[PDB]
Write a protein that binds this DNA or RNA. Structure first.
Lengths: 90, 63
DNA sequence: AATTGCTGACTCATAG
DNA sequence: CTATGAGTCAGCAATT
C-alpha cells in the first residue's frame, strides 16, 4: 500500500540503508503490487462495459416496442381514411 | 506429468474462455446496433405515417 | 533510463 | 471434467 502509493522520490527516502539486491527486490515487489491493481481495474472496466451494454439493450428493446405500437396505431388510422376514400371512388 | 497435462488442458480452457468473452461482447454490441437501426427506422416510419395520414384526412375534409 | 499503465496469456484454486 | 476468478509476468507504448 505505502509501497505502491509512495512516489519514487519519497520511496528512496526510505531505501537509505538498503543493499542493492534488496532495493531491486523491493522495487520488483512494488511493480508486482501495482500490476495486481492494474489487472483489477482492467477487469473491472470490462464488467462495467458489459453492464452498460446490457442496460442499453434492455432500454432500447423497451423504446422499440413502444415505437412499434405507435406505428401500428398510426397505420390503422391512415388505413381507416383510405377505406373511406376508396369507398367514395365506389 | 499429471501436472503437465492438467496445465495444457487448462491453458486451452483459458484461451477458449477469453475468446468466448470477446465474442459475447461483440455479439452484445451488434444486438445493440441492430436495435438502434430498428428504432431509427421506426421513427422515420412514424414521421411518414403522420404525413400520409394528414394528407388523406385533409383531402377527405376539403372535398 | 526507469517507471508506469494496460492487456494478453499462463497458472493455481475452485466454481459449476 | 471444463469454465472461471484472480494473481502473475511478458511486452508494448506513454510518461517522467
Amino acid at each position: 500500500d505505502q509501497l505502491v502509493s509512495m512516489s519514487v522520490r519519497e520511496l528512496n527516502r526510505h531505501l537509505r540503508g538498503f543493499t542493492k539486491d534488496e532495493v531491486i527486490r523491493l522495487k520488483q515487489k512494488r511493480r508486482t503490487l501495482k500490476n495486481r491493481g492494474y489487472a483489477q481495474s482492467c477487469r473491472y472496466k470490462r464488467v462495467q462495459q458489459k453492464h452498460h451494454l446490457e442496460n442499453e439493450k434492455t432500454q432500447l428493446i423497451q423504446q422499440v416496442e413502444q415505437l412499434k405500437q405507435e406505428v401500428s396505431r398510426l397505420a390503422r388510422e391512415r388505413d381507416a381514411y383510405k377505406v373511406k376514400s376508396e369507398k367514395l371512388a365506389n | 506429468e499429471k501436472r503437465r497435462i492438467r496445465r495444457e488442458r487448462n491453458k486451452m480452457a483459458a484461451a477458449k474462455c477469453r475468446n468466448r468473452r470477446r465474442e459475447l461482447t461483440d455479439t452484445l454490441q451488434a444486438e445493440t446496433d441492430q436495435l438502434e437501426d430498428e428504432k431509427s427506422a421506426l421513427q422515420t416510419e412514424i414521421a411518414n405515417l403522420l404525413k400520409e395520414k394528414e394528407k388523406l384526412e385533409f383531402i377527405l375534409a376539403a372535398h
